[model samples]
Target: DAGHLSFVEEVFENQTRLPGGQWIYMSDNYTDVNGEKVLPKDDIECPLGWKWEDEEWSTDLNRAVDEQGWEYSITIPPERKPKHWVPAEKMYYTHRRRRWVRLRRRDLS
Candidate 1:
């Protein structure tokens, strides 16, 4: 039901206390981690063999490394064009036999 446009988010140790244990912190760097976790987003799916935890997709560094190593990640897919189509500028032609000989405006005389 989806393509490979998925992304992975992780859990980290926050300064504030939460009921469970860890909370998500603000960071652009995905490698920054005091604690580790993986959570899923909506409608997106992980690569094969990854588990969905916390209703969000969940996996740890160990789980990802053990299965996908570092190779799995999100990126845009490539584009494609139709094979049977031609551009413009090449549609004119002239042909000849004898009686069927075509003529330009100057050759009509």
Candidate 2:
């Protein structure tokens, strides 16, 4: 089922080159399998060619390139990346109650 699906719209891609010449792709709405989203969690259901690592899902990211594939080691999705990250006086969010309070702090105590 590799070529089974075709795009009706543009798909977004974030590629990270691997030492072995593969890429780590983080996507929004990548799955049509379980109605679940990929990032913000290790919970991933990948398409063909990609491996699902979490005994439950699969993952990877970043633009890393060129290294020993490892005498023995593997890479995976670390803490998911936010579409955007603002570190300076950036606000924090409480989660779904479903509710999120925006809390922020800045310099000079």
Candidate 3:
């Protein structure tokens, strides 16, 4: 059906365009490993928020303002992660705990 195809297209577009838009691929289908629930290696999630840093810079033409505007430093806590898996290193970032919220378009018809 054309409606079904359109719906799939929308879903794909959303998955690709969105920041946390990636499919989770799992090798084993088992639920438990050594009596513990095995979590998937890869998962798609949303971004919690942006991380900022404060930088101090000396300006020659600085006014008598006590506190000047904050200077842009770095944007940390990004959502994306490396494709390969690391043994001891933290594979997933702590900020990648955002749940994927599904949004549906309102039906006009």
Candidate 4:
């Protein structure tokens, strides 16, 4: 019966969603899916259209001039930004039991 489910689906099943709709694998140990060790990587990816806060995305931060000749940039506030799983030391967390943590930005490197 387990073989019927795709590996991708199995991965998400083990993840826990946080307050802000961010997903994280809570277990300190790796997961065994189809005899494969599924572990969270030290470096995780940011959401679509999201970039690392410490890294540069553009000179103007996506600022562009419209046909009306007005410059504007769509900004997602720092507090409102989406979160993704990041290295434990890269950001601060209070959950000692849950080693897996999430961050608003991508990896530094």
Best by lDDT: 4
Overall lDDT per candidate, in order of appearance = 0.26, 0.26, 0.21, 0.30
Which consecutive 10 residues in model 3 have the weakest lDDT in total?
A: 8-17
Give the winner by TM-score: 3 or 4.
4
Q: Could you tell me every candidate's TM-score relative to the true structure?
A: 0.17, 0.17, 0.15, 0.19
Q: In terms of lDDT, which candidate is stronger, 1 or 4?
A: 4
lDDT per residue for candidate 1 within 1-109, as digits (tens), equals: 3332333444322121133333233232132233232231233344454444335334443432323222111112352311121111121211100000111111111
Worst 10 residues of 4 by lDDT: 4-13
Query: Which residue pairs collide in model 4, if any?
Result: none
Segments of candidate 2 deviating more than 4 angstroms: 1-40, 52-85, 90-109
**C-alpha-based local distance difference test score of model 4:** 0.30
Clashes of each: 4, 0, 0, 0
> Candidate 2, after superposition: displacement of residue 70 in Å?
30
Candidate 4: residue 44 lDDT (0-100): 44
Cα error of candidate 3 at position 54, Å: 37
Q: Which one wins by lDDT: 2 or 4?
A: 4
